Amino acid sequence: EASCGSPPPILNGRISYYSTPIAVGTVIRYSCSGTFRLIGEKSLLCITKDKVDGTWDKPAPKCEYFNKYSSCPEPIVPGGYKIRGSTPYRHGDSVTFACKTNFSMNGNKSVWCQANNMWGPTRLPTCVSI
Ligand SMILES: *[C@@H]1O[C@H](CO)[C@@H](O)[C@H](O)[C@H]1NC(C)=O
Ligand SMILES: *[C@@H]1O[C@H](CO)[C@@H](O)[C@H](O)[C@H]1NC(C)=O
């Protein structure tokens, strides 16, 4: 059966338990110590596109040293709406979006407020009328 290689490591962070070989369907969780903030989706899933090679479904998140002064402006996604997240958006805070009725999403539904005062680590999702 297809399997995944070692999960992407994380500076100043930890990964939850995983057995080897890593079977397709395996999920691992990332976390950071108290003085750091996890940026990006915390859970990775081992998938396979061709049933021969296994690959993780997304890049690993990262741990950023807490910057207490950082804040992000209200993120806006045309055709979509915020379903989770409250202002003010400080370092490590996240917002989740859903597309309006008759719109379909492309991209990650959640973004995080980074130390550089920008939303990331990915672009905000796009909601397209279908
Ligand atoms: C972002 O979302 C896309 C589309 O769902 C996915 O393919 C990609 O792996 C995600 N990346 C991260 C860092 O979450
Ligand atoms: C949204 O409405 C349009 C027009 O009726 C239609 O083409 C599309 O399939 C609808 N989307 C969903 C998810 O029902």
Residue in 45, 48, 49 with CA at minimum distance from that of residue 57: 45
Same-domain status, 94 and 125? yes
Q: Method used for this model? A: X-ray
Count of structural domains within the chain: 2
Residue ending a domain, choose from 14, 46, 65: 65
Contacts of 119 (CB under 8 A, 6+ apart): 72, 75, 95, 111, 112, 113
Per the omega criterion (within 30 degrees of 0), is the bond before 59 cis? Answer: no
Residues 83, 97: Cα–Cα separation, whole Å:
5
Same-domain status, 60 and 82? no
64 lines ligand 1 (CB under 6 A): no
Same-domain status, 102 and 123? yes
> Which residue puts its alpha carbon closest to atom 7 of ligand 1?
58
How many CB atoms lie under 10 A from the CB of residue 67? 15
Residues 53, 45: Cα–Cα separation, whole Å:
14
Same-domain status, 49 and 97? no
DSSP string spanning 54-77?
-EESS---EEEEP-TT-EEPPP--
Residues 48, 34: Cα–Cα separation, whole Å:
34
Residue ending a domain, choose from 36, 65, 94: 65
Indicate the resolution in Å: 1.8
Q: Which of 102, 103, 128 to mutate to test the pocket of ligand 2 (most atoms within 8 A of CB)?
A: 102
Q: Which ligand is nearest to the CA of 130?
A: 2
Same-domain status, 31 and 57? yes
Element (DSSP H or E) covering residue 14:
strand 13-15
Same-domain status, 60 and 112? no
Residues 29, 84: Cα–Cα separation, whole Å:
21
